[PDB]
C-alpha cells in the first residue's frame, strides 16, 4: 500500500493515567486510502490532531479499531482503552467524534458529520478540545459547519468510499496500537 | 474548440448533483435488481418456513422478526397466488375500496409487494397513494434547528411554523449536550404558534427516550430501523431491542413512527447486493412486526443515494406507496437535500404532494438551509411563497397557509417572551430583552446575538441528571404571566394519559381535538369523493401575497 | 371496546385513569401549581393501553394491538429500569444470562409476561445470530 | 422594524409573477365559474334547437358550427344524462378503455365535457392523460428562432434539436419579411439533424398557407382559434374560414393541427362573462368539428391569464385532458413563459411530462431564451441537462435524450455548410466561412456575426415573388456537395404526397416511418400494459452526462 | 383500407399517384435534377385523399374523414383560387352574393359540392352574424 | 387633453404616414403599459417622422381596438400606404397598404419594453418606408420575463381599452397640442 505512515506495534493495552486522548482510526484509514473525501492527507489530518492534543498539555496515542468501520463504534474502542476516558474517532473519508466513556456509542461530546467541510485547521481544533475535555474543561464546542449542498456533493461518494473501508473490518480483532511515522 | 451550448450547460447546478452507474454488486440500483428474491411463503404448523426464497434456517434476525410477526398469514395464500400485475391494477383503480386491499397487502410477503408497485409508473402510483393514505387529511411536519442550538430562535421559529400550518415539527442539535433546551424551546414556541402541533427531538435512541420520559417531546420519529443485519447492527439496534423500544414510548403515552428509507444500507456499507427498494421493503415490514403505527421513509436522509441512479425518486415514491399499502401512517420525506437543482427538487416533492400523504413532508426546513441541523431540507423557508403558489396553482392542499407578517412578528414574540418567561422561572441562563427582539425579526441565526454556549449545556444537562420534568415548564410559564401558554402545554401532557393519539397518523387540531386514521378514515373512491380542498379551507389557500384586484 | 369508542377523551373520558388513579379533569393549572397533582400522577395505565389495544385489533390493527399490550406491561416498569432493558437488547450489551434474568425479573416484579417473552426470544436469536456480548 | 424572513420571501422570483383576484365579470377566472351555462341539449328533426342553455335563435357562430359539426346528435341526450361524476370516473379508471370513452365524450357539449373533468384532481387528470392520449408513443416539439432572424443559426440550432430528440420544430419571425429564409434553414437543419423532422414557420394565416404551399415548410401548427364570436373576429376568422383553411392544408397533403388556449379571449378583450375552461372547451369543439386531426392548447401563448388566477394550472391540464379525450392529438403548451420560479414552472411541466401527451411540450426552446422569438418559452437550452436527469429518476420518457458535445458540434457544423450550399446555389446573400464556424459553436444570436438584414429581406420575398418552390432547395442540395441531405428532403417533400401524416398525432420515425395514432394506438389498462419506458431507450435516457462508474 | 392497410408509404406505396399520375419512385434526385419530374407533378390526388378518408372512418373518427372529402374537392382548385376564398371567407371581406357566387364556381367549375355547401352556409350565417363587408 | 377632434379622416399628399392611435389613447388612458406618457410617445414617433422630411397625420380609430386593424385603416387612408398603429397600452406595427391585415412591415410585441427613444426610431423607419427607402429594422426587443410580468397587466388594460370600441364609425383625424 503506498503512503504507509502507521505500523501496527501490538494489542493496545488501557490506559491507567487520565493524562491521555486515545486517536482511533478506522480499519482503513492511511491504507487503502490515504486522503479523506475532499483529498486532505490522512498524515495531515493525524498530525494536526496529535498537535491539538499535546498542545494543550496532553498525550496523545494512536490506535486503529477492526471491529467496526463505524466511526461512533470506532471511537468507542478508543474511549474504553484511553486513560482519560476520551477518545477521537477518525474515518478514512474524514467523519470524526469526540467520544467519552459512559456515553451511548452513538452520543458523544462533539460530532463532525460533514467531512468535505473539515479543514487541516478544524482537525487541529478538534484535537484541542479533546484534550480540554480529558482536563475536565468544558471548552466552548468546535464551531458547527454546515452546507445544505455537501450531501448533494458527496452523499454517494461517502457511501461509495464507506463501501470500500468496510472491506478491512476483522470479526473480534482487538484494536492494535499504532507507531505513527511523523 | 468548445460549443458554448455546453459551456452553458456545464455550469449548471445540476451538473454538480452526484450521479452514479448502477453497481448491483454493492446494491447501488434503485429498484427491480436481478438479485433481489423472487416472492414466496412456505407455511407449516402456522409458521412461516420459507420467506421470497430463503429457507428459515437462513433467516437472519429481519426475516425472523417479519416472518412472525409481519406477515398477515390470514390470507397469505390468497394473495400470493393473485397476479402481481392485477394487484398493481387493484392499488390504482379508484374503485377497489382501501378497506378491500389492506387485508391483501397485508398478506404479502417483502418481495410480493415490491414485485406489485414495480409494475407501477409514477403517475399510477400517484393515483394509487390518494387512495392507500390512511389518514383522509393530509399533514405536514416541519424542521426547526440553527447552527448555534439557540433556544431562543428555535421558539420563534417553532411558532411561526405552527402558524403557518405545520401540525409536526422537530429539532435536533449540533451539539447533543443541548438537547433539552432545543426540545423545551420548541415545545414552547410551537403550543404558542398553534396549540397541540406535536414536537420531536431527534437523538440517539437512550438520549431520546430519556427526554421523552422528563416530558420535553410529544412524541419521536427518528426510531430507526435497517433493512440489512450488519447496517441493523452499526445503527445499535436489532428488530427486537427496536421492537421494545417502540412499546417503551407507547407505555409512557407517547406517540412514535419508526423511520427507515432507501439507501441506507449503501451508504452504511452492506447492502448484501440487494435493490434499495427490496431492502427498504424489509424495514417497512419490520415497522409493521413491531406493531408501530407509522413510519418515515422516502430515502430520507440518504435521499443522495437512490437519487444518483436511475429511477431512485420513482423507487421514493414506491416505498411510500408501499409503506401507505401496509396500514402504516407515510410521513413522507421531502426532507432532505440531494440536488443543486430547483427544477429537481420540485419533481421529487410533487411526487408525494399532488396525491397527498400523512405528511407530505416529514421535515420542510421552517429556517433557511443554512440552518439546517439535518444537513438541508428539499424545501427550506425561503420557499413558503412558492409553495402556497403552486397549492393556488393546483388545487392541491399542501397542508401550508399564506400568513401575514404583522401576524408573524406577533407570534414569535410572543413565543421569545414565553421561553424568556421559562428561563428566568427555572433559572436558566438568562434571555435578554436584546435575544427577543433579535428572535422576533430573524430570518436565521446570522441575525441572532452570540449565546455563552457553555453555560447553556451546563444548565441543559442539569435537566437531565435532576429529572427536572415539564410541569416544571408549565409553573415557570405560569408564575411569568403566561397563563395561557401554560394552559395549552398542560394539555399536550394531558393527551399522553388517553391513548388517543397513539393510533395511525394522529394529530391534534383545534380545540385539542385528536385526528386519526381511526376517526379520519380515508374513503377515496375516484372524482368528487375523499378529501378534497374546498370551503374555508380553499379559500384560504387561494389569498396568497401579491394577488391584486384587477378593476 | 370499538372504533366507535374512539376517541376516548370524547367518547368515554370516564374509562381513562392514571397510574395514582387520578382522572382526567384532576390536571387542572391550578393543581399542578400547587402541586396537588405531580408528575408521578400523570402517567398512562395498562387499563387505558389495553382498552386502545382493543380499538386497534377492531380497526384492523392486530399488530399495533400487540405493541400497546407489551406497553400496558411495561407502564409498571420504572423510568431508569425500562432503560436499562432496552440497552440491555442492544448488540454485544449482554450475554444470554443477562438477557434470561431480564425476563424472569419482568415477570416477578411486574408479571409482564409477554415482554418476558419477547425478551426470551431475542436471547434465543441473539445465539444464533451472534449479538451477545463477545460476538464482536 | 421588518421580519428578515419576509424580506427575504420578499427578493424571491416568484414574487415578480403576476397574480389577480377572480374578476367573474371579465373571465378572469380559470373554471368552475356561476356565470359558466349548464350543460345541456335540444335536438329536433335531427338539428339542435338549445346548447348549454341557449336557444338556437341566439346562436354565434360558434354555436352553429359546434352545434352543426362537433357532437354526436345521435347519442347527445343520452349522454347528457349521464352522471358527470361516474364520467369523471371513468376518465381515470385504468379498467374502462379509451375506445369505450371516446364515444360518450365525442357526445358531450361543451359544457358537459367541463363539468366531468372539473369533478377531477390533477393526480385523476393524469392517470387519465395515460390512456387518453391517442398516440402510445409520447413526443415532443421544439422552437428554434432568434431575435436577429439570422439564418445559419437556426439551421445549426434546428440540427440541434433534431439530434437531442425533437420530432417536430418550430420558427417564427421577428421581422415578417424574413420568414422564407428562416423556414429554409429550420427544414434543412432539422433534416441535417435527423430525417423526418417535420418543421412549421407561424405567420399570419394567408402568408403561413402561401409558404407551405411552396414547399418550404412541412405542417402547420398555429391555426388559431377562439372562444368568442368578437375575439374570433380579432384573431381575423370565422369557424368557416377556419375551417376551410384547414381542408386547404390537407388538399395540398400539408399536416396541420388548430391552436387554442385557455385566456385568449380575456387577453383579447372579449370573455363574455365565462370561465377560461369552458371557453377553452368551445375552441375543442370547434376544432374536432371542422375534422382537424389535432390540437395546440393548454394555454400556450397565453398562459400569464389562468396562472394569475386559482386553479389555473390544473384547468391548463384540464383542457388538455378535454382535447385527448375528443379524440384528438394534443400538442400540450408547455412553450411559453409564466413565471420568474424554476419550481413554479417545473411543477406546471410535470401535469403533462408525467402522463405524456403526443408532445409533451409543444415549443420547449432549443434556443437560450433571450432568442426565443414566442417571448421565451417555459423550458430552454439551458434546461437540457435538467430534463434528462428528471427523465432518468422517475423513468418518464419526456422525448428528449442526452448527447455528446462532439457530436452536436459535427451535426451543427454540416447543417451550417449545408444551408451554405443552398444561399450559394439559389443565388442568396452569402453565407461565410467564418458564420459557419460561429454557428457551429454558437449558444446563440449573441455568438454570432452580424448580417446584412435589409439584404436577406430584398432575397427573402423573392422566394414568395417569384414562388421560388422546394425543389431549388433540393437542386441547390444536390449540387452543392450535399446528395445525402438533398435526398432526405426530396423524402420530406414526398411525404406530402400520401396522406399518412396528415391522420392523428402522425410523425416520421427512424427510417421514414409513419407513426401516427392509427399504427401506434394507445392500449393503456393500467400497470405493465400501455407505453413503458423500457429497453434501449430506456439505456438511452439512463446514460446521462456526469454519472461517475462505482467500481 | 383498413388500419391495418396503414401508412401506405410502408404497406402500399404502389397505392401513391400523383396528379399528373406519376409515382412516388419517379421522384429522385435524377428526376427532380432533370426536370423529368417539377413541383407541379408533385401534388396529393383526391384519390389518396379518399383512402385516407377511409382509414379514418376505421379508426373511428368520422370529422376527420369530412375533412379529408373537402381537401380532395379542393385538390381541382388552383393555389390562388383557394388563397381567394379563404380570404373571401374572413370577417367584413364579402358581400353575400360574392360569397354565393363562389359557391357556385365552386359546384359548377370544380364538382366541389360539400365544399359549395359549406360556403353557402357560412353566407346565410354571416348575414346573421353581421361578418359580411360593411358590418364592422 | 392634448388630443382633439378635427373631423372624419380623409384619405391622403404621397408624402405622409398616419400615426392611427386606438380608441382611449390619450383620454381614459394617457400612459402606456409602464408609465411613458401618450404625450410623450406621440411627440417622438411625430418628430420622428417629421425629421425625415415627411409629414405626421394622426387619427383615432373606432371599430376595433386591436392594433392591427386600427394600423389597416389607418394604411388605406395613408397617402403612402404607410401607418403606424399604437395601442393605449403602446403596442406598435407599422403597416403597409396591401398587405392582410394581421401581417406587417414591423411589428412591436412587448410594449413594456418600448422607450421613447424607440417610439423616435419607429417614426423615422415609417418616413423611410413612405419614401420607398429599405431602412434597417427597429432591432428586435425581446425579454422572456416580459409576459410574466406584465400580460395579466396587458390584458387588463386591453380589456378596458376595448370598452371604446365603436362598431360603424370612421377614424377621426386628430389635432395634437403644441
Ligand atoms: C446522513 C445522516 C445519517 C444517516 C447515515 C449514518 C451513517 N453512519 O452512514 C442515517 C440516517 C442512517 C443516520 C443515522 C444516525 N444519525 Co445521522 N445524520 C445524517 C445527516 C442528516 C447528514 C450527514 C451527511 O450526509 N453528511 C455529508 C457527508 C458527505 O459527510 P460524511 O462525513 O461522510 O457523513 C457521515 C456522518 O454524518 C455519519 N453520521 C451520520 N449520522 C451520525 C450520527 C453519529 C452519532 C455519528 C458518529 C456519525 C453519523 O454518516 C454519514 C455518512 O457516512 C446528519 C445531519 C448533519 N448536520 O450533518 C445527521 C446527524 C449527524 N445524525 C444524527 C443522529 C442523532 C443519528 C443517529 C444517532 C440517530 C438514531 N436514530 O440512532 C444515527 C446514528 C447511526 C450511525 N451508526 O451513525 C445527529 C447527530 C446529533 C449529534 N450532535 O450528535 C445529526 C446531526 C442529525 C440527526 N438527528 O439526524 N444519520
Ligand atoms: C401573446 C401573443 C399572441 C396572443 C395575443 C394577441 C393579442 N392580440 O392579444 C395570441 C396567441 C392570441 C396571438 C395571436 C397572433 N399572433 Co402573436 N404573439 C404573442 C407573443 C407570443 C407574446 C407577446 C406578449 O405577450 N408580449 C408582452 C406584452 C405585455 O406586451 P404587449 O405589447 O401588451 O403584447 C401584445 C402584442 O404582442 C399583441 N400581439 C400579439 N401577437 C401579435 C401579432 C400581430 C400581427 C400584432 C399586430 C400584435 C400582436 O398582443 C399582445 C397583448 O395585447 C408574441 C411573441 C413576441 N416575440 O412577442 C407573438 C407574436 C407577436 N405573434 C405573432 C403572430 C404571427 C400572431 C398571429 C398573426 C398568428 C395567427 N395565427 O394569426 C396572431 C394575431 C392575432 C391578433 N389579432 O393580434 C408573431 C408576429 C410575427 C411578426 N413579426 O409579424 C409573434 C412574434 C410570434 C408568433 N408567431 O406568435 N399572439
Ligand atoms: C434524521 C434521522 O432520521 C433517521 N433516518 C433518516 N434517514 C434514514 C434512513 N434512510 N434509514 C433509517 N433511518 C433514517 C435517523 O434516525 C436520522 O438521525
Ligand atoms: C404562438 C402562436 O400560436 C397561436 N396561439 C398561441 N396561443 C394561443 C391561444 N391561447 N389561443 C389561440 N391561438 C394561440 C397563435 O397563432 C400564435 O401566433
Ligand atoms: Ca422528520
Ligand atoms: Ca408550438
Ligand atoms: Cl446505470
Ligand atoms: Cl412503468
Ligand atoms: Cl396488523
Ligand atoms: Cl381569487
Ligand atoms: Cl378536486
Ligand atoms: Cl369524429
Ligand atoms: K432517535
Ligand atoms: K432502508
Ligand atoms: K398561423
Ligand atoms: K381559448
Same mark, same amino acid.
Given at each position: 500500500?503506498?503512503?504507509?505512515?502507521?505500523?501496527?506495534?501490538?494489542?493496545?493495552?488501557?490506559?491507567?493515567?487520565?493524562?491521555?486522548?486515545?486517536?482511533?482510526?478506522?480499519?482503513?484509514?492511511?491504507?487503502?486510502?490515504?486522503?479523506?473525501?475532499?483529498?486532505?492527507?490522512?498524515?495531515?489530518?493525524?498530525?494536526?490532531?496529535?498537535?491539538?492534543?499535546?498542545?494543550?498539555?496532553?498525550?496523545?496515542?494512536?490506535?486503529?479499531?477492526?471491529?467496526?468501520?463505524?466511526?461512533?463504534?470506532?471511537?468507542?474502542?478508543?474511549?474504553?482503552?484511553?486513560?482519560?476516558?476520551?477518545?477521537?474517532?477518525?474515518?478514512?473519508?474524514?467523519?470524526?467524534?469526540?467520544?467519552?466513556?459512559?456515553?451511548?456509542?452513538?452520543?458523544?461530546?462533539?460530532?463532525?458529520?460533514?467531512?468535505?467541510?473539515?479543514?487541516?485547521?478544524?482537525?487541529?481544533?478538534?484535537?484541542?478540545?479533546?484534550?480540554?475535555?480529558?482536563?475536565?474543561?468544558?471548552?466552548?464546542?468546535?464551531?458547527?459547519?454546515?452546507?445544505?449542498?455537501?450531501?448533494?456533493?458527496?452523499?454517494?461518494?461517502?457511501?461509495?468510499?464507506?463501501?470500500?473501508?468496510?472491506?478491512?473490518?476483522?470479526?473480534?480483532?482487538?484494536?492494535?496500537?499504532?507507531?505513527?511515522?511523523? | 474548440?468548445?460549443?458554448?451550448?455546453?459551456?452553458?450547460?456545464?455550469?449548471?447546478?445540476?451538473?454538480?448533483?452526484?450521479?452514479?452507474?448502477?453497481?448491483?454488486?454493492?446494491?447501488?440500483?434503485?429498484?427491480?435488481?436481478?438479485?433481489?428474491?423472487?416472492?414466496?411463503?412456505?407455511?407449516?404448523?402456522?409458521?412461516?418456513?420459507?420467506?421470497?426464497?430463503?429457507?428459515?434456517?437462513?433467516?437472519?434476525?429481519?426475516?425472523?422478526?417479519?416472518?412472525?410477526?409481519?406477515?398477515?398469514?390470514?390470507?397469505?395464500?390468497?394473495?400470493?397466488?393473485?397476479?402481481?400485475?392485477?394487484?398493481?391494477?387493484?392499488?390504482?383503480?379508484?374503485?377497489?375500496?382501501?378497506?378491500?386491499?389492506?387485508?391483501?397487502?397485508?398478506?404479502?410477503?417483502?418481495?410480493?409487494?415490491?414485485?406489485?408497485?414495480?409494475?407501477?409508473?409514477?403517475?399510477?402510483?400517484?393515483?394509487?397513494?390518494?387512495?392507500?393514505?390512511?389518514?383522509?387529511?393530509?399533514?405536514?411536519?416541519?424542521?426547526? !434547528?440553527?447552527?448555534? +442550538?439557540? *433556544?431562543?430562535?428555535?421558539?420563534?421559529? #417553532?411558532?411561526?411554523? =405552527?402558524? &403557518? /400550518?405545520?401540525?409536526?415539527?422537530?429539532?435536533?442539535?449540533?451539539?447533543?449536550?443541548?438537547?433539552?433546551?432545543?426540545?423545551?424551546?420548541?415545545?414552547?414556541?410551537?403550543?404558542?404558534?398553534?396549540?397541540?402541533?406535536?414536537?420531536?427531538?431527534?437523538?440517539?435512541?437512550?438520549?431520546?427516550?430519556?427526554?421523552?420520559?422528563?416530558?420535553?417531546?410529544?412524541?419521536?420519529?427518528?426510531?430507526?430501523?435497517?433493512?440489512?443485519?450488519?447496517?441493523? !447492527?452499526?445503527?445499535? +439496534?436489532? *428488530?427486537?431491542?427496536?421492537?421494545?423500544? #417502540?412499546?417503551?414510548? =407507547?407505555? &409512557? /403515552?407517547?406517540?412514535?413512527?419508526?423511520?427507515?428509507?432507501?439507501?441506507?444500507?449503501?451508504?452504511?456499507?452492506?447492502?448484501?447486493?440487494?435493490?434499495?427498494?427490496?431492502?427498504?421493503?424489509?424495514?417497512?415490514?419490520?415497522?409493521?412486526?413491531?406493531?408501530?403505527?407509522?413510519?418515515?421513509?422516502?430515502?430520507?436522509?440518504?435521499?443522495?443515494?437512490?437519487?444518483?441512479?436511475?429511477?431512485?425518486?420513482?423507487?421514493?415514491?414506491?416505498?411510500?406507496?408501499?409503506?401507505?399499502?401496509?396500514?402504516?401512517?407515510?410521513?413522507?420525506?421531502?426532507?432532505?437535500?440531494?440536488?443543486?437543482?430547483?427544477?429537481?427538487?420540485?419533481?421529487?416533492?410533487?411526487?408525494?404532494?399532488?396525491?397527498?400523504?400523512?405528511?407530505?413532508?416529514?421535515?420542510?426546513?421552517?429556517?433557511?438551509?443554512?440552518?439546517?441541523?439535518?444537513?438541508?431540507?428539499?424545501?427550506?423557508?425561503?420557499?413558503?411563497?412558492?409553495?402556497?403558489?403552486?397549492?393556488?396553482?393546483?388545487?392541491?392542499?399542501?397542508?401550508?397557509?399564506?400568513?401575514?407578517?404583522?401576524?408573524?412578528?406577533?407570534?414569535?414574540?410572543?413565543?421569545?417572551?414565553?421561553?424568556?418567561?421559562?428561563?428566568?422561572?427555572?433559572?436558566?441562563?438568562?434571555?435578554?430583552?436584546?435575544?427577543?427582539?433579535?428572535?422576533?425579526?430573524?430570518?436565521?441565526?446570522?441575525?441572532?446575538?452570540?449565546?455563552?454556549?457553555?453555560?447553556?449545556?451546563?444548565?441543559?444537562?442539569?435537566?437531565?441528571?435532576?429529572?427536572?420534568?415539564?410541569?416544571?415548564?408549565?409553573?415557570?410559564?405560569?408564575?411569568?404571566?403566561?397563563?395561557?401558554?401554560?394552559?395549552?402545554?398542560?394539555?399536550?401532557?394531558?393527551?399522553?394519559?388517553?391513548?388517543?393519539?397513539?393510533?395511525?397518523?394522529?394529530?391534534?387540531?383545534?380545540?385539542?381535538?385528536?385526528?386519526?386514521?381511526?376517526?379520519?378514515?380515508?374513503?377515496?373512491?375516484?372524482?368528487?369523493?375523499?378529501?378534497?380542498?374546498?370551503?374555508?379551507?380553499?379559500?384560504?389557500?387561494?389569498?396568497?401575497?401579491?394577488?391584486?384586484?384587477?378593476? | 371496546?370499538?372504533?366507535?369508542?374512539?376517541?376516548?377523551?370524547?367518547?368515554?373520558?370516564?374509562?381513562?385513569?392514571?397510574?395514582?388513579?387520578?382522572?382526567?379533569?384532576?390536571?387542572?393549572?391550578?393543581?399542578?401549581?400547587?402541586?396537588?397533582?405531580?408528575?408521578?400522577?400523570?402517567?398512562?395505565?395498562?387499563?387505558?393501553?389495553?382498552?386502545?389495544?382493543?380499538?386497534?385489533?377492531?380497526?384492523?390493527?392486530?399488530?399495533?394491538?400487540?405493541?400497546?399490550?407489551?406497553?400496558?406491561?411495561?407502564?409498571?416498569?420504572?423510568?431508569?429500569?425500562?432503560?436499562?432493558?432496552?440497552?440491555?437488547?442492544?448488540?454485544?450489551?449482554?450475554?444470554?444470562?443477562?438477557?434470561?434474568?431480564?425476563?424472569?425479573?419482568?415477570?416477578?416484579?411486574?408479571?409482564?409476561?409477554?415482554?418476558?417473552?419477547?425478551?426470551?426470544?431475542?436471547?434465543?436469536?441473539?445465539?444464533?445470530?451472534?449479538?451477545?456480548?463477545?460476538?464482536?
Amino acid at each position: 500500500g503506498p503512503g504507509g505512515f502507521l505500523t501496527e506495534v501490538g494489542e493496545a493495552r488501557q490506559g491507567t493515567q487520565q493524562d491521555e486522548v486515545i486517536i482511533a482510526v478506522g480499519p482503513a484509514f492511511g491504507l487503502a486510502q490515504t486522503v479523506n473525501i475532499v483529498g486532505i492527507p490522512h498524515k495531515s489530518i493525524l498530525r494536526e490532531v496529535i498537535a491539538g492534543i499535546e498542545e494543550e498539555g496532553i498525550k496523545a496515542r494512536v490506535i486503529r479499531c477492526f471491529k467496526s468501520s463505524d466511526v461512533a463504534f470506532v471511537a468507542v474502542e478508543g474511549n474504553r482503552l484511553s486513560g482519560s476516558g476520551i477518545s477521537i474517532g477518525i474515518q478514512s473519508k474524514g467523519t470524526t467524534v469526540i467520544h467519552q466513556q459512559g456515553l451511548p456509542p452513538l452520543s458523544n461530546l462533539e460530532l463532525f458529520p460533514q467531512a468535505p467541510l473539515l479543514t487541516l485547521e478544524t482537525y487541529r481544533q478538534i484535537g484541542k478540545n479533546a484534550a480540554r475535555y480529558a482536563k475536565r474543561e468544558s471548552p466552548q464546542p468546535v464551531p458547527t459547519l454546515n452546507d445544505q449542498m455537501a450531501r448533494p456533493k458527496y452523499q454517494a461518494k461517502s457511501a461509495i468510499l464507506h463501501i470500500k473501508e468496510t472491506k478491512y473490518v476483522v470479526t473480534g480483532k482487538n484494536p492494535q496500537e499504532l507507531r505513527v511515522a511523523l | 474548440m468548445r460549443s458554448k451550448r455546453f459551456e452553458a450547460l456545464a455550469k449548471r447546478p445540476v451538473n454538480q448533483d452526484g450521479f452514479v452507474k448502477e453497481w448491483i454488486e454493492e446494491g447501488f440500483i434503485a429498484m427491480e435488481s436481478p438479485n433481489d428474491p423472487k416472492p414466496s411463503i412456505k407455511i407449516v404448523n402456522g409458521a412461516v418456513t420459507e420467506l421470497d426464497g430463503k429457507p428459515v434456517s437462513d433467516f437472519d434476525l429481519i426475516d425472523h422478526f417479519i416472518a412472525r410477526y409481519g406477515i398477515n398469514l390470514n390470507r397469505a395464500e390468497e394473495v400470493m397466488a393473485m397476479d402481481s400485475v392485477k394487484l398493481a391494477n387493484m392499488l390504482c383503480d379508484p374503485n377497489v375500496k382501501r378497506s378491500e386491499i389492506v387485508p391483501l397487502t397485508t398478506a404479502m410477503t417483502p418481495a410480493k409487494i415490491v414485485e406489485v408497485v414495480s409494475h407501477m409508473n409514477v403517475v399510477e402510483m400517484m393515483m394509487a397513494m390518494q387512495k392507500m393514505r390512511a389518514r383522509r387529511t393530509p399533514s405536514q411536519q416541519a424542521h426547526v !434547528t440553527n447552527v448555534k +442550538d439557540n *433556544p431562543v430562535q428555535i421558539a420563534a421559529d #417553532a411558532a411561526e411554523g =405552527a402558524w &403557518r /400550518g405545520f401540525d409536526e415539527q422537530e429539532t435536533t442539535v449540533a451539539v447533543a449536550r443541548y438537547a433539552p433546551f432545543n426540545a423545551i424551546a420548541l415545545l414552547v414556541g410551537s403550543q404558542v404558534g398553534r396549540p397541540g402541533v406535536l414536537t420531536q427531538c431527534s437523538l440517539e435512541e437512550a438520549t431520546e427516550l430519556k427526554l421523552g420520559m422528563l416530558g420535553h417531546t410529544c412524541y419521536a420519529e427518528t426510531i430507526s430501523v435497517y433493512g440489512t443485519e450488519p447496517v441493523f !447492527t452499526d445503527g445499535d +439496534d436489532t *428488530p427486537w431491542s427496536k421492537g421494545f423500544l #417502540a412499546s417503551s414510548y =407507547a407505555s &409512557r /403515552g407517547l406517540k412514535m413512527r419508526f423511520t427507515s428509507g432507501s439507501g441506507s444500507e449503501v451508504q452504511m456499507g452492506y447492502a448484501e447486493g440487494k435493490s434499495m427498494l427490496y431492502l427498504e421493503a424489509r424495514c417497512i415490514y419490520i415497522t409493521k412486526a413491531a406493531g408501530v403505527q407509522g413510519l418515515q421513509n422516502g430515502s430520507v436522509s440518504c435521499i443522495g443515494v437512490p437519487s444518483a441512479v436511475p429511477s431512485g425518486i420513482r423507487a421514493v415514491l414506491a416505498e411510500n406507496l408501499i409503506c401507505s399499502s401496509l396500514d402504516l401512517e407515510c410521513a413522507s420525506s421531502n426532507d432532505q437535500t440531494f440536488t443543486h437543482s430547483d427544477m429537481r427538487r420540485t419533481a421529487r416533492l410533487l411526487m408525494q404532494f399532488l396525491p397527498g400523504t400523512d405528511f407530505i413532508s416529514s421535515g420542510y426546513s421552517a429556517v433557511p438551509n443554512y440552518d439546517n441541523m439535518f444537513a438541508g431540507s428539499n424545501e427550506d423557508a425561503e420557499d413558503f411563497d412558492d409553495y402556497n403558489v403552486i397549492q393556488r396553482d393546483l388545487k392541491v392542499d399542501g397542508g401550508l397557509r399564506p400568513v401575514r407578517e404583522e401576524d408573524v412578528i406577533a407570534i414569535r414574540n410572543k413565543a421569545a417572551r414565553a421561553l424568556q418567561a421559562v428561563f428566568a422561572g427555572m433559572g436558566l441562563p438568562p434571555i435578554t430583552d436584546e435575544e427577543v427582539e433579535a428572535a422576533t425579526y430573524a430570518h436565521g441565526s446570522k441575525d441572532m446575538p452570540e449565546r455563552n454556549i457553555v453555560e447553556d449545556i451546563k444548565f441543559a444537562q442539569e435537566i437531565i441528571n435532576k429529572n427536572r420534568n415539564g410541569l416544571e415548564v408549565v409553573k415557570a410559564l405560569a408564575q411569568g404571566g403566561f397563563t395561557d401558554v401554560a394552559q395549552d402545554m398542560l394539555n399536550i401532557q394531558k393527551a399522553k394519559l388517553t391513548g388517543d393519539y397513539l393510533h395511525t397518523s394522529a394529530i391534534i387540531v383545534g380545540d385539542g381535538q385528536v385526528l386519526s386514521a381511526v376517526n379520519d378514515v380515508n374513503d377515496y373512491a375516484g372524482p368528487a369523493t375523499g378529501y378534497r380542498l374546498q370551503g374555508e379551507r380553499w379559500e384560504e389557500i387561494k389569498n396568497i401575497p401579491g394577488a391584486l384586484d384587477p378593476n | 371496546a370499538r372504533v366507535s369508542d374512539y376517541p376516548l377523551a370524547n367518547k368515554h373520558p370516564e374509562w381513562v385513569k392514571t397510574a395514582t388513579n387520578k382522572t382526567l379533569d384532576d390536571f387542572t393549572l391550578e393543581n399542578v401549581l400547587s402541586n396537588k397533582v405531580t408528575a408521578q400522577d400523570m402517567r398512562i395505565t395498562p387499563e387505558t393501553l389495553r382498552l386502545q389495544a382493543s380499538i386497534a385489533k377492531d380497526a384492523g390493527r392486530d399488530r399495533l394491538a400487540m405493541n400497546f399490550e407489551r406497553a400496558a406491561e411495561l407502564t409498571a416498569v420504572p423510568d431508569d429500569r425500562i432503560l436499562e432493558i432496552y440497552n440491555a437488547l442492544r448488540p454485544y450489551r449482554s450475554t444470554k444470562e443477562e438477557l434470561l434474568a431480564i425476563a424472569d425479573d419482568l415477570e416477578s416484579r411486574y408479571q409482564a409476561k409477554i415482554c418476558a417473552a419477547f425478551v426470551r426470544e431475542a436471547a434465543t436469536l441473539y445465539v444464533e445470530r451472534k449479538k451477545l456480548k463477545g460476538d464482536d
